[PDB]
Design an enzyme around this catalytic site. Structure first.
Site, short mmCIF file in Angstrom:
data_model
loop_
_atom_site.label_atom_id
_atom_site.label_comp_id
_atom_site.label_asym_id
_atom_site.label_seq_id
_atom_site.Cartn_x
_atom_site.Cartn_y
_atom_site.Cartn_z
N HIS A 133 -2.87 0.96 7.09
CA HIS A 133 -3.13 1.02 5.67
C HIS A 133 -3.13 2.47 5.25
CE1 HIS A 133 -4.51 0.00 1.75
NE2 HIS A 133 -5.77 0.34 1.92
N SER A 168 -4.21 -2.69 -2.21
CA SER A 168 -4.61 -3.41 -1.01
C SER A 168 -4.77 -4.87 -1.39
CB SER A 168 -5.91 -2.85 -0.43
OG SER A 168 -6.29 -3.60 0.72
N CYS A 219 0.81 -1.25 0.00
CA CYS A 219 0.00 0.00 0.00
C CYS A 219 0.82 1.26 0.00
CB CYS A 219 -1.00 -0.02 1.17
SG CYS A 219 -0.42 0.36 2.82
#
Ligand SMILES: *[C@@H](C(=O)N[C@@H](Cc1ccc(O)cc1)C(=O)O)[C@@H](O)C(=O)OCC
EC number: 3.4.17.17
Lengths: 246, 44
Positions: free
Chosen positions: A146, A163, A111
């Site tokens: 994330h 992702s 990510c």
């Protein structure tokens, strides 16, 4: 845990051998799986995707789709070894050199790498504003971090990213407010049985080729465990308004 | 020229072989993660 390639390229022996040692532990078939790849007489050569190149017949949404498709084709990196080291407090110009290396090596990415690559590939379009969006979530006993690249253009919000989950990365440039984008991510996470713990919004990222300032990742930080959605919205909208006033 | 295109250097060949191994590995590890995800979705 996962490993990071801190040897650059060419990947050194220690990093390469460590990559295989790690997946032999993770994968149930262990050394059998590893040997089947490492000792194969012939392995298929993956096609090399072309780096996206803007053309006049593209809209901004078209161009964002081309960029996102490129990152999807590189693939999310599940090997356990992140191939490109990203020190997220480094000056932007140095991160852009790493983005160039990603396009030369053409390997899977995770990510954070995808945020840096998304900045690089949108630097040529000054009407696209880019800013990092970060989430800390909880799932099944563990915490996960994330980041995606928020996008603002012409009164709409969207995102680019990578992702392991399809609903935690690119979002179309159709959200009328920053809050609507953030709540779409939250609802996506909840469908995956994650609970969001923290949301962080960064600053707009400069387009200029040799910017020596770092990316700002956490101009706004929300600890949402005991916040009502209405109060999360109020804070996000106040911050977004400040972003757009410059 | 003609000759150079027939045969890549040892270095070029190694880089391409390592990339092939990385993508072969990424395929099996992506499938493993997808299985564990697919399994968990049904177990809820
Ligand atoms: C950031 C990253 O890749 N984040 C992961 C977060 C995640 C989402 C969903 C589940 O179930 C687990 C984890 C992702 O989006 O796939 C990246 O640079 C990184 O290495 O973070 C490690 C988690």
């Amino acid at each position: 845990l996962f490993h990071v390639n801190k040897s650059g390229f060419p990947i050194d022996s220690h990093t390469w051998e460590r990559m295989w040692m790690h997946v032999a532990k993770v994968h149930p078939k262990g050394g059998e799986m590893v040997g089947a790849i490492r000792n194969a007489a012939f392995l298929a050569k993956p096609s090399i995707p072309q780096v996206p190149n803007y053309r006049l017949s593209m809209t901004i949404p078209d161009w964002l789709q081309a960029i996102q498709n490129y990152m999807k084709t590189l693939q999310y990196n599940h090997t356990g070894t992140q191939f490109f080291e990203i020190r997220k407090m480094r000056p932007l110009s140095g991160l852009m050199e790493t983005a160039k290396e990603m396009t030369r090596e053409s390997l899977p990415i995770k990510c954070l790498e995808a945020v840096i690559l998304g900045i690089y590939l949108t630097n040529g379009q000054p009407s696209i504003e880019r800013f990092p969006i970060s989430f800390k979530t909880y799932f099944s006993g563990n915490y996960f971090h994330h980041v995606v690249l928020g996008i603002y253009c012409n009164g709409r919000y969207g995102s680019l990213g990578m992702s392991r989950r399809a609903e935690l990365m690119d979002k179309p440039l159709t959200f009328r407010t920053l809050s609507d984008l953030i709540f779409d991510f939250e609802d996506s996470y909840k469908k995956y049985l994650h609970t969001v713990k923290k949301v962080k919004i960064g600053l707009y990222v400069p387009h200029e080729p040799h910017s020596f300032q770092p990316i700002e990742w956490k101009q706004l930080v929300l600890n949402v465990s005991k916040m009502l959605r209405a109060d999360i919205r109020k804070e996000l909208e106040k911050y977004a308004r400040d972003m757009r006033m410059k | 020229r003609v000759e150079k295109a027939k045969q890549k250097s040892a270095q070029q060949e190694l880089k391409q072989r390592q990339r092939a191994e990385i993508y072969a590995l990424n395929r099996v590890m992506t499938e493993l993660e997808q299985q564990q995800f697919d399994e968990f979705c049904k177990q809820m």
